[PDB]
Write an enzyme that holds these catalytic residues in place. Structure first.
Site, PDB file in Angstrom:
ATOM      1  N   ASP A  94      -0.652  -7.207   2.454  1.00  0.00           N
ATOM      2  CA  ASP A  94      -0.078  -5.735   1.925  1.00  0.00           C
ATOM      3  C   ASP A  94       1.926  -5.865   1.899  1.00  0.00           C
ATOM      4  O   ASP A  94       2.444  -6.133   3.038  1.00  0.00           O
ATOM      5  CB  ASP A  94      -0.371  -4.514   3.115  1.00  0.00           C
ATOM      6  CG  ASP A  94      -0.456  -3.408   3.001  1.00  0.00           C
ATOM      7  OD1 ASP A  94       0.213  -2.360   1.910  1.00  0.00           O
ATOM      8  OD2 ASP A  94       0.085  -2.733   4.395  1.00  0.00           O
ATOM      9  N   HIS A 125       0.669  -1.358  -0.025  1.00  0.00           N
ATOM     10  CA  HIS A 125      -0.079  -0.121   0.120  1.00  0.00           C
ATOM     11  C   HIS A 125       0.909   1.496   0.035  1.00  0.00           C
ATOM     12  O   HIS A 125       0.353   1.798  -0.567  1.00  0.00           O
ATOM     13  CB  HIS A 125      -1.164  -0.110   1.140  1.00  0.00           C
ATOM     14  CG  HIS A 125      -0.801   0.604   2.652  1.00  0.00           C
ATOM     15  ND1 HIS A 125      -0.170  -0.007   3.551  1.00  0.00           N
ATOM     16  CD2 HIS A 125      -0.583   2.102   2.640  1.00  0.00           C
ATOM     17  CE1 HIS A 125      -0.296   0.437   4.608  1.00  0.00           C
ATOM     18  NE2 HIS A 125       0.256   1.647   4.141  1.00  0.00           N
ATOM     19  N   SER A 161       3.815   3.299   8.159  1.00  0.00           N
ATOM     20  CA  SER A 161       3.933   2.025   7.139  1.00  0.00           C
ATOM     21  C   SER A 161       4.655   1.255   7.084  1.00  0.00           C
ATOM     22  O   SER A 161       5.056   2.189   6.552  1.00  0.00           O
ATOM     23  CB  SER A 161       2.235   1.805   6.557  1.00  0.00           C
ATOM     24  OG  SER A 161       1.243   2.397   6.999  1.00  0.00           O
ATOM     25  N   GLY A 162       4.370  -0.312   6.110  1.00  0.00           N
ATOM     26  CA  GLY A 162       5.611  -0.462   5.379  1.00  0.00           C
ATOM     27  C   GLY A 162       6.847  -0.774   6.579  1.00  0.00           C
ATOM     28  O   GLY A 162       7.746  -1.497   5.949  1.00  0.00           O
TER      29      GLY A 162
HETATM   30  C1  LIG Z   1      -8.082  -2.293   6.717  1.00  0.00           C
HETATM   31  N1  LIG Z   1      -8.166  -1.788   5.610  1.00  0.00           N
HETATM   32  C2  LIG Z   1      -8.881  -2.096   4.216  1.00  0.00           C
HETATM   33  C3  LIG Z   1      -9.450  -1.246   3.108  1.00  0.00           C
HETATM   34  N2  LIG Z   1      -9.166  -0.174   4.210  1.00  0.00           N
HETATM   35  C4  LIG Z   1      -8.719  -0.107   5.238  1.00  0.00           C
HETATM   36  C5  LIG Z   1      -8.562   0.578   5.874  1.00  0.00           C
HETATM   37  C6  LIG Z   1      -9.244   1.402   7.438  1.00  0.00           C
HETATM   38  C7  LIG Z   1      -8.861   1.548   9.016  1.00  0.00           C
HETATM   39  C8  LIG Z   1      -7.469   2.269   8.521  1.00  0.00           C
HETATM   40  C9  LIG Z   1      -6.525   1.765   7.205  1.00  0.00           C
HETATM   41  O1  LIG Z   1      -5.515   2.645   7.328  1.00  0.00           O
HETATM   42  C10 LIG Z   1      -4.444   3.188   7.625  1.00  0.00           C
HETATM   43  N3  LIG Z   1      -3.839   3.582   8.628  1.00  0.00           N
HETATM   44  C11 LIG Z   1      -3.109   4.314   9.427  1.00  0.00           C
HETATM   45  O2  LIG Z   1      -2.673   4.210   9.864  1.00  0.00           O
HETATM   46  C12 LIG Z   1      -1.661   3.599  10.358  1.00  0.00           C
HETATM   47  C13 LIG Z   1      -1.928   3.407  11.789  1.00  0.00           C
HETATM   48  C14 LIG Z   1      -0.969   2.201  12.330  1.00  0.00           C
HETATM   49  C15 LIG Z   1      -1.257   1.728  13.669  1.00  0.00           C
HETATM   50  N4  LIG Z   1      -2.152   2.142  14.567  1.00  0.00           N
HETATM   51  N5  LIG Z   1      -1.055   0.438  14.265  1.00  0.00           N
HETATM   52  C16 LIG Z   1      -0.374   1.681  11.479  1.00  0.00           C
HETATM   53  C17 LIG Z   1       0.024   1.617  10.021  1.00  0.00           C
HETATM   54  C18 LIG Z   1      -0.647   3.583   9.741  1.00  0.00           C
HETATM   55  O3  LIG Z   1      -0.795   3.467   8.061  1.00  0.00           O
HETATM   56  C19 LIG Z   1      -3.144   5.888   8.260  1.00  0.00           C
HETATM   57  F1  LIG Z   1      -3.060   6.802   8.459  1.00  0.00           F
HETATM   58  C20 LIG Z   1      -4.762   5.848   7.179  1.00  0.00           C
HETATM   59  N6  LIG Z   1      -5.010   7.171   6.673  1.00  0.00           N
HETATM   60  C21 LIG Z   1      -4.039   7.416   5.207  1.00  0.00           C
HETATM   61  C22 LIG Z   1      -5.807   8.034   7.319  1.00  0.00           C
HETATM   62  C23 LIG Z   1      -5.777   8.222   8.445  1.00  0.00           C
HETATM   63  O4  LIG Z   1      -6.621   7.893   9.447  1.00  0.00           O
HETATM   64  O5  LIG Z   1      -4.921   9.471   8.599  1.00  0.00           O
HETATM   65  C24 LIG Z   1      -5.198   4.887   6.792  1.00  0.00           C
HETATM   66  F2  LIG Z   1      -5.400   4.565   6.130  1.00  0.00           F
HETATM   67  C25 LIG Z   1      -6.923   1.381   6.322  1.00  0.00           C
END
Ligand SMILES: CN1CCN=C1c1cccc(Oc2nc(Oc3cc(C(=N)N)ccc3O)c(F)c(N(C)CC(=O)O)c2F)c1
Ligand SMILES: [Ca+2]
Ligand SMILES: [Cl-]
Lengths: 234, 52
Positions: free
Chosen positions: A88, A42, A185-186
């Site tokens: 992913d 992603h 992420s990643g």
């Molecule tokens: C599981 N599926 C299937 C389809 N979509 C999702 C999905 C649903 C909700 C969020 C999602 O991902 C997402 N995660 C985010 O934050 C993270 C959080 C964590 C963590 N807390 N450990 C780790 C890595 C991240 O990248 C994000 F910032 C976004 N952003 C880019 C937006 C933001 O919150 O600022 C986002 F879409 C993906």
């Protein structure tokens, strides 16, 4: 990373940072070998062009061990899905090899069976990155790490509002406000076993960051060990 | 127990064969004479923090 501590000199040598055209770190990665970087599929969609920086712990200061590498090949999992975030995972083949040194070293890829019965059954793993220090805050200029406990699969399923596939696992605290976050992420999720760190996950996603009742979701690397291996023989 | 008993005394990978333990190592490591320990072959073996 929300919480945790700064990675001290030489503590997270396998951390890689994917940088865009403005030289902004947008995702993390794990050094696998001199030519390969492991990251989330992603993140590929977050930059038309990007490079990879290694040996960096402070984005605002010159440490001397940093080095940027161009990506010669991007190998994405062809089954990656944006709607679910399933599969992913991606491997980057670098144009020039990384020379290991202080703060630049690869994490070990374990064997699947042993990794699942032994590493994933340990109490915790370690996640790291230059991501946000607060859900709505700014990304860190300092590399951070955080010990995250493995979370039982059923509890994992019950906490989420989105589908948790078999290619994912939860890690974190239900209560405690410590978690990976956006920008991480990643990046790497490793498990230490007798002083050696093995790759066990890739920071994938999460509902917000450090929310009570929510966990950070990671790509289950052990399910892709053969895929990674094949990719590295590119 | 075999691998279930303290990783079969292996430093890293442990596998059970014909009711016994077989240890092995990650790339960059050589299995020691004791057939259990993992010895790095270089200065920057994988999985090791660079505390040098
Ligand atoms: C599981 N599926 C299937 C389809 N979509 C999702 C999905 C649903 C909700 C969020 C999602 O991902 C997402 N995660 C985010 O934050 C993270 C959080 C964590 C963590 N807390 N450990 C780790 C890595 C991240 O990248 C994000 F910032 C976004 N952003 C880019 C937006 C933001 O919150 O600022 C986002 F879409 C993906
Ligand atoms: Ca720097
Ligand atoms: Cl380098």
């Amino acid at each position: 990373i929300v919480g945790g501590q700064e990675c001290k000199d030489g503590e997270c040598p396998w951390q890689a940072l994917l940088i865009n055209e403005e030289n902004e770190g947008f995702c993390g990665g794990t050094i696998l070998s001199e030519f390969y970087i492991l990251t989330a599929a992603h993140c590929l969609y977050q930059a038309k062009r990007f490079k990879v920086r290694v040996g960096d712990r402070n984005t605002e200061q010159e440490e001397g061990g940093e080095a940027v590498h161009e990506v010669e090949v991007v190998i994405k999992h062809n089954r990656f899905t944006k709607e679910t975030y399933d599969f992913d995972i991606a491997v980057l083949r670098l144009k020039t090899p990384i020379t290991f040194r202080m703060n630049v070293a690869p994490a070990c890829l374990p064997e699947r069976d042993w990794a699942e019965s032994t590493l994933m059954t340990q109490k915790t793993g370690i996640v790291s990155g230059f991501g946000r220090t607060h859900e709505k805050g700014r990304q860190s200029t300092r590399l951070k790490m955080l010990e995250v406990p493995y979370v039982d699969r059923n509890s994992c399923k019950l906490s989420s509002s989105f589908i948790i596939t078999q290619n994912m696992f939860c890690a974190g605290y239900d209560t405690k406000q410590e978690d990976a976050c956006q920008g991480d992420s990643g990046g790497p999720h490793v498990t230490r076993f007798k002083d050696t760190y093995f790759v066990t996950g890739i920071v994938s996603w999460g509902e917000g960051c450090a929310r009570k009742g929510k966990y950070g979701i990671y790509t289950k690397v052990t399910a892709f060990l053969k895929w990674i291996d094949r990719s590295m023989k590119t | 127990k075999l691998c279930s008993l303290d990783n079969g005394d292996c430093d890293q990978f442990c596998h059970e064969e014909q009711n016994s333990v077989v240890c092995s190592c990650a790339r960059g490591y050589t299995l020691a004479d004791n057939g259990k320990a993992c010895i790095p072959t270089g200065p920057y073996p994988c999985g090791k923090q660079t505390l040098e």
